[PDB]
């Protein structure tokens, strides 16, 4: 096989629409995300204005290919692809997809999708402007899917937390964690994942000793 | 069925442009805003601008399919099913859609269309800064189908108005409340259905 | 005929990019404004941001159908019908449909296409500010077809101006009044019709 | 034939990718631009804010039909035509296109294509304020046809009294540029507007 | 052959998002900025605002054709070619492309997309109101593809780094330089390459 025969038996058969279930477990999704920068701060309104890497990884066991003699890699327009429906809870502006909506797919059905994304949170600016810094709250999981059927788990606890944070940015990262929760909306009788983010950072400008 | 199957079954029959009314019945449309956040108010220009959920629920039994050993539920792309038509009357920007465009699908046809969205709207801002708050109306319903199509049905179950209110807005909620109106306009004989939610709030 | 085969049989057939000519005849498109509200309003740069409804009225008889055991009328994707294609000369931005885009196609194939809009105009705002008010004049009509393919005319529905006027609006509306008229272009050779529609307005 | 038969035969027959070049010579192109409104200028950033009429015409032998007892003209969705690729150089904001995107098609091949359009560009201003007035010239051409595929020519009328600018002048001229990326020269017009605030 | 059937073969056959590997060398792609205008900068925030042609290169043997007795370019929408998943790292905006998206396709397979681009980034702005200028560095490179599938490589080191740059913009360019970088990034074990495009400029006016 070689690349042209991967992605086109992807196109023809892989059902973007279909959740790739494994008997009857969830598919599992990890998400992680790489401060890029943040723009615009509000301590009034508690907006922030940010960009970001999504790194998104999940296993679609229906992409898979006998790499044996073959490229171990391609790169799949999402439009072909079936996506998790992520969507950050506290998001006051639609997405800004910045990069080319291109994921990354495995051999053996992994994918990594990692788009670059421009977009405003409402969360807790109070501090910013402190040396303890605020911390931002930004709450992703599946809009649509439950528990069986997506968990969302924080990908590697290991990372330089501004390895990609432009140096140019007023703002400065102290620290970025992650946590895991499950909740359960009036809605639905059924429980749903989400991955809580908390990004703690200040305004350059109060650490001064002189 | 697998959920493969369901899906095919679905996008291949799917008639997103046909209501799904039986036997001239109206489709009967529940509707339901859960505020997320109140981002900007002007009382001078009586224009806020508002995040929420806009629960949306019926049912298309064109849909329908035996879960006896089968998924109950699909998630679905809208584009894939009909959708009802409708439209708030004093909104004065596009909905915002900030959320993937994919309905809840049950096996019994039931269908729950849940998109968070951003939206200005005109209505009364007078008094937010007092403690007595103001209180915002929002129109909601069909703009194409009259009421033995549509009926837009306004009653809520279990839900709390704050529940899914941002702690961190400049604003909060009162209280919210919902009614149900029958109108007839000028262009036609038919009354059109709809659900005003009035979203008292105020200022922290 | 069910509504499943009334839009299968539209959407197999409409010839969207056809204009519904009958022998030698225009399309008679009668076009009115509903205001809904006026946003915006600039005396220096003579700009106003407006919402309406764009009441907009013709006959495709390749629509129509048999009614006798059948539905009436079926709201339709515009993306199947042919649409006038009506500009309004003056607006210095876009058109912002703010409602779905369905028109409602009666058996006998008459057509209501009447969405909300959003949309900015260059505009006489003199006087805007005092008791006489200003009048903000409106032009509409076909963007290619001439007075032999378009024909277009007021409708009015003597309802009340304010009928669907946002009484949160800065502004309240004095009077509106249509015009119709015939002009010739230095580009072609035919007449092309048009409605101008003179809204008399003044802040509150 | 009635309208119905010759859209059909168009949209079935439309190669909107190809350009409608016959016996090796280039597409003559004429373009004018009939100013409707200046909304907004910017002295210090020299920027421009303008609503004109893009009234745009070419010849596609291809969309011909024999109107014997027929229509002489029909309007056709111009995603079912070709269009030149047309661009302002100076412009800083994407084309807005105002107008339904519909071109007149002569049933001899002749199109018409005349969308509103506003959009902003970057110009000289200076002057703007003074009876001389400022002098915004700005330049269009086909982005990536060489000037043996397309040739471009030019061709207050419609300008809006409730402006707060006026027009003293417009005046056209047509330029053969070569590009630093290419051998071939591009043409291109230049549309000097000549305008004042009242 | 002519123009519609060049098109029509290419259409019908091109396999828009499948990169045209040849023989496992990588595709080379040529990227080049060809600044155009600086419409606002925010030295507080350190934020520009630009409009550029990128000018972007490769070959794709898979278009090429006979071109004896034929046509030897076309223009073809880019919807119907593989085109380079190229993205400005610090980038803060979607690219807003100002100009039809055609490329220039050559009978061999070489291909011109130049499209005109508006996009605001994130860079380093201090110094512009000064006579030594800002110097706003830009990173672009593929966002999908590693080494082994894009390198990315200058245009050019030999231009006039102020040939289409507009007289009436506030600012002007004082010199621009390209570096070519390969990096690994902490998801993936491959290197990506980038062409990082230094604008140093100022504002007109001492
Ligand atoms: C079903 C269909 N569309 C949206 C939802 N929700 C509630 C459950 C968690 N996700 C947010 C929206 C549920
Ligand atoms: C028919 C076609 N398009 C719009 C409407 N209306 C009137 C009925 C109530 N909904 C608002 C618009 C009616
Ligand atoms: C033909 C093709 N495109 C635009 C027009 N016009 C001139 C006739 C009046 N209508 C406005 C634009 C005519
Ligand atoms: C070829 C492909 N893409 C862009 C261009 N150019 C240079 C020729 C003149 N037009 C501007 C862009 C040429
Ligand atoms: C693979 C799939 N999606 C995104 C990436 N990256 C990391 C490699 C460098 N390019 C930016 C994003 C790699």
């Known amino acids: 096989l070689d690349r042209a025969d991967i992605l086109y038996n992807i196109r ?41 890497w999504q790194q998104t990884t999940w ?10 003699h073959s490229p171990d890699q391609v790169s799949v ?23 080319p909506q291109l994921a990354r797919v495995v051999s053996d059905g992994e994918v990594l999708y990692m788009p670059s994304i421009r977009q405003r949170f409402s969360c807790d600016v109070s501090g910013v402007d402190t040396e303890s810094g605020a911390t931002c709250r930004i709450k992703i999981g599946s809009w649509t899917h439950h528990s069986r059927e997506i968990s969302v788990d924080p990908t590697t606890e290991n990372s330089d937390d501004s390895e990609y944070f432009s140096q140019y940015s007023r703002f400065e990262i102290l620290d970025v964690t992650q946590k ?10 059924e429980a749903y994942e989400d991955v809580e983010v908390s990004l703690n950072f200040r305004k350059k400008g109060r650490s001064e000793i002189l």
Do not use: G, H, M
């Not at 992520?86 to 997809?97: C, D, G, H, Q, T």
């Open 77 to 99: 327009p999402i439009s072909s692809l079936w996506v998790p429906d992520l969507a950050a809870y506290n998001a006051i502006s639609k997405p800004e997809v910045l990069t």
């Open 180 to 189: 895991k929760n499950s909740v359960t909306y009036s809605c639905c009788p």
């Open 12 to 52: 023809q058969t892989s059902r973007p629409d279909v959740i790739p279930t494994q008997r009857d477990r969830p598919v599992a999704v990890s998400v992680s995300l790489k401060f890029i920068n943040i723009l615009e701060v509000n301590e009034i309104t508690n907006e922030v204005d940010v960009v970001f």
């Open 59 to 68: 296993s679609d066991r229906t992409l898979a290919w006998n790499s044996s």
